[PDB]
Amino acid sequence: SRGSPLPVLSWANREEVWKIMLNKEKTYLRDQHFLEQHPLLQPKMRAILLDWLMEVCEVYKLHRETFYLAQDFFDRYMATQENVVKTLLQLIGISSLFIAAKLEEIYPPKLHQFAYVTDGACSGDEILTMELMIMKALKWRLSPLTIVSWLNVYMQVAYLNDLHEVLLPQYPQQIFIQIAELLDLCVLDVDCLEFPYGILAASALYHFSSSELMQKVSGYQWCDIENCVKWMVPFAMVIRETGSSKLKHFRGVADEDAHNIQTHRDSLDLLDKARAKK
Amino acid sequence: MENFQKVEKIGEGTYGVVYKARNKLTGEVVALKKIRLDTETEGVPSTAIREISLLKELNHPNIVKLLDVIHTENKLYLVFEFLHQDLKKFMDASALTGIPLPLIKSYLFQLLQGLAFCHSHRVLHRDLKPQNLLINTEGAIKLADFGLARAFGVPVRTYTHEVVTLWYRAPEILLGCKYYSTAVDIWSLGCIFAEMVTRRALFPGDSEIDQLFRIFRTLGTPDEVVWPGVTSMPDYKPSFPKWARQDFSKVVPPLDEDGRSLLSQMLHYDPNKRISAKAALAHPFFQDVTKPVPHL
Ligand SMILES: CCS(=O)(=O)c1ccc(Nc2ncc3cc(Cl)c(=O)n(C4CCCC4)c3n2)c(C)c1
């Protein structure tokens, strides 16, 4: 079974909080084969769309959490549909990001920016149509635990101090962005959806640390993550060869917060290197 | 929406009109939150997306139940369970005799059961005010209007800077704190608790600052010893009026000792010392577990 990594919580009961989180990992399903419902689509098309959403996120200083919400909304929406044509993918992705930004950001960009970045491919009204199509097809289940939120949990446990206050941010920035960069690479490959989000985050963490740390912060046993770890090896290789990106700073964002902002990597070639090795 | 007959408008909450209405098939009585969408430049507003998605996750006897979400041409209806009135109209209808104190055990206990559930699900309500507190005829009382709620992360980051209706807003917010989480909801409940007894708002501020000073007058102006950090908070001014912690029998007489204890632990200045919803449930004060039918 799974260890309970959370400390004693002053604000609620750690056992209840953890069991709720684990049930969130159960009721939100992802399907590594959903593109088989779309015979005109290829996995590279998904990678190109998601990579472009990362670019849009960086231009607008959106949170990592917003990107991963959009990624999850896109993957689960597409699993509810059939026979989507490639000319619709931009609209589905940008509307997923619009929903996610409205959920997650304090002051999100306005509708007109989400249309603007598509460079004429999508109008505002088209985005308003698609957002309703997405939310209804997902039955309004719009509160997943994203990949990056699992990484946030793990980092907080890892650097818990005397205070046992898991809600105030206590982890250093560089480790967070480096693991995140590996996850941003992996998520571009639809095969990642084979692994639960908490195992993807634990496996990326592992490739940047040790089994001791992985088990300490996630409660997984090595056999739980072994296949994911093995799958991730070439992506970790490509990142290590290329070297980790440095912390960027952002206009209007305090430097101590800048690690929370999604960055963009021209890493579709990295993705190809990683998959070529298999 | 052919299966719903609107009875009467019930009021406007955080977004759009609420209606009393009847399920034509079963005769069930429901509240209908309407959202007109062609009024909205951004499509489905973020408050509605948050409320719907949070309430699909939250099923508790002390949280109003979201029954359905219906989309018709330019409109979005949220079908909720029916309750009978908010606590602000109940309070002020019983504002002469006061509200009998066994119901104030009942209502503060149930409200804490709800909030403890929200917080274990990592949801901040951020608008616990009696107009959003529904109490029905069986007596139960339910948290409602999650239009201002937010799921908080582990760890949190900076969220929306001015939240909770002013009479219920916590001091850390008024001073522009970088981080807040569950304490802000507990504060709100204290303001409501004393508002039940005094049958009058504990801090009926007319302004941001007036709300701050109502708090200082009643609890004493805080300092680096009662709340370590106050002096380094953004909206802290040295010029504030040093006031005295008026005994917890003046600011609120009907209370016994435990009522004073609980309430003061809920109005602790330091969010990090302030009591959790779980702990408030374990306070002696909730040893007699009364559940009276109200007058309506
Ligand atoms: C002038 C107010 S009153 O006392 O006449 C009155 C108040 C409440 C209710 N009932 C009720 N039942 C279920 C919901 C579900 C939701 Cl989501 C909701 O928002 N509200 C209301 C709360 C805030 C505005 C709408 C509900 N209200 C009634 C019948 C009268």
Q: Give contacts of B 149-168 with A, CB under 8 A.
A: 151-161
Whole-angstrom distance, CA of residue B87 vs CA of residue B195? 10
Tokens representing A275? 């998959």
- A219: CB partners within 8 A, 6+ apart: A2, A3, A4, A5
Say which DSSP state B64 is in. Answer: P
- Does A105 reside within a domain? yes
Both A52 and A159 in one domain: the answer is no
- Does A123 reside within a domain? yes
The number of domains in chain A is 2
Tell me the β-bridge partners of B33: B18, B78
Residues of A whose CB is below 8 A from B114 = none
Whole-angstrom distance, CA of residue A59 vs CA of residue A51? 13
Both A156 and A239 in one domain: the answer is yes
Say which DSSP state B198 is in. Answer: S
- Does A18 reside within a domain? no
Both A173 and A122 in one domain: the answer is no
B127 is catalytic: yes
Q: Which of B120, B151, B181 sits opposite A143 (nearest CB)?
A: B151
Q: Which residue of A has its CA nearest to B43?
A: A128
Tokens 């069991």 correspond to: A19
Domain boundary among A137, A166, A181: A137
Q: Does domain B1-84 have CATH number 3.30.360.10?
A: no
Whether the upstream peptide bond of residue B155 has omega within 30° of 0, thus cis, is: yes
Domain boundary among A77, A104, A137: A137
Tell me the β-bridge partners of B71: B76
- Sheet holding B4-12: strands in order across? B4-12, B17-23, B29-36, B75-81, B66-72
- Does A211 reside within a domain? yes
Both A156 and A270 in one domain: the answer is yes
Both A104 and A157 in one domain: the answer is no
Q: Minimal CA–CA distance to A79: which of A149, A22, A23, A134?
A: A134
- Reported residue count of chain A is 278
Region label for A248, one of left (φ > 0), alpha (ψ between -120 and 50) or beta (otherwise): beta
Both A106 and A219 in one domain: the answer is no
Annotated binding residue at B86? yes
Both A57 and A158 in one domain: the answer is no
Whole-angstrom distance, CA of residue A5 vs CA of residue A213? 11
Give chain A as a DSSP string: ---------SSS-HHHHHHHHHHHHHHS---TTGGGG-TT--HHHHHHHHHHHHHHHHHTT-BHHHHHHHHHHHHHHHHT-----HHHHHHHHHHHHHHHHHHH-SSPPPHHHHHHTTTTSS-HHHHHHHHHHHHHHTTT------HHHHHHHHHHHHT--TT--SSS--S-HHHHHHHHHHHHHHHTSGGGGGS-HHHHHHHHHHHTS-HHHHHHHH---HHHHHHHHHHHHHHHHHHHHH-PPPPP--TTS-GGGGGGB------HHHHHHHHHT-
Whole-angstrom distance, CA of residue B136 vs CA of residue A30? 41
Whole-angstrom distance, CA of residue A19 vs CA of residue A61? 33
Both A203 and A93 in one domain: the answer is no
Q: How far is A95 from chain B (nearest CA, A)?
A: 11
Say which DSSP state B267 is in. Answer: S
Both A171 and A243 in one domain: the answer is yes
Tell me the β-bridge partners of B76: B35, B71
Both A124 and A164 in one domain: the answer is no
Residues B200, B130: contact at Cβ < 8 Å? no
Annotated binding residue at B15? yes
- B138: CB partners within 8 A, 6+ apart: B293
Domain boundary among A106, A137, A168: A137
Beta strands in B114-211 (DSSP E): 123-124, 133-134, 142-143, 150-151
The CATH number of residue A150's host domain is: 1.10.472.10
Q: What is the resolution of this structure in A?
A: 2.5
DSSP run (H or E) holding B204: none
User: What is the assigned CATH class of domain B85-296?
Assistant: mainly alpha
Mark yes or no for CB contact A12/B119 under 8 Å: yes
CA B166 to chain centre: 12
Whole-angstrom distance, CA of residue B70 vs CA of residue A40? 32
Neighbours of B242 (CB within 10 A): 8
Q: What sign results for the dihedral spanned by CA atoms B176, B182, B188, B191? A: negative
Mark yes or no for CB contact B45/A106 under 8 Å: no
Among protein residues, the one with the nearest Cα to ligand 1's atom 24 is: B13
Which amino acids bring their CB within 6 angstroms of ligand 1?
Answer: B 10-11, 13, 18, 20, 31, 33, 64, 80, 82-86, 89, 131-132, 134, 144-145
Residues B139, B106: contact at Cβ < 8 Å? yes
Q: How far is A43 from chain B (nearest CA, A)?
A: 29
Confirm or reject contact between B39 and chain A (CB < 8 A): no
Residues A24, A144: contact at Cβ < 8 Å? yes
What's the gap in Å between B286 CA and the centre of ligand 1? 27
- Does A19 reside within a domain? no
Both A115 and A164 in one domain: the answer is no
Q: What sign results for the dihedral spanned by CA atoms A188, A193, A197, A203? A: negative
Tell me if residue B81 falls in helix, strand or coil: strand
Q: Minimal CA–CA distance to A3: which of A223, A228, A224, A216?
A: A216
Residues of B whose CB is below 8 A from A168 = 155-156, 179
What's the gap in Å between B111 CA and the centre of ligand 1? 16
Neighbours of B241 (CB within 10 A): 8
Domain range holding A67?
29-137
Annotated binding residue at B70? no
What's the gap in Å between B254 CA and the centre of ligand 1? 29
Say which DSSP state B202 is in. Answer: S
Among protein residues, the one with the nearest Cα to ligand 1's atom 17 is: B145
Whole-angstrom distance, CA of residue B130 vs CA of residue B168? 10
Both A183 and A124 in one domain: the answer is no
Q: Minimal CA–CA distance to B111: which of B193, B30, B228, B180?
A: B193
Residues A57, A262: contact at Cβ < 8 Å? yes
Q: Which of B78, B120, B179 to mutate to test the interface with A (most CBs of A within 10 A)?
A: B120
Residues B141, B230: contact at Cβ < 8 Å? no
Every domain of chain B with CATH number 3.30.200.20 lies at 1-84
Q: How many CA atoms lie within 13 A of B57 on its CB side?
A: 28
- Does A22 reside within a domain? no
Residues B176, B263: contact at Cβ < 8 Å? no
Q: Give contacts of A 141-180 with B, CB under 8 A.
A: 141-143, 149, 152-153, 156, 165-171
Mark yes or no for CB contact A102/B44 under 8 Å: yes
Annotated binding residue at B130? yes
Annotated binding residue at B242? no
Confirm or reject contact between A254 and chain B (CB < 8 A): no
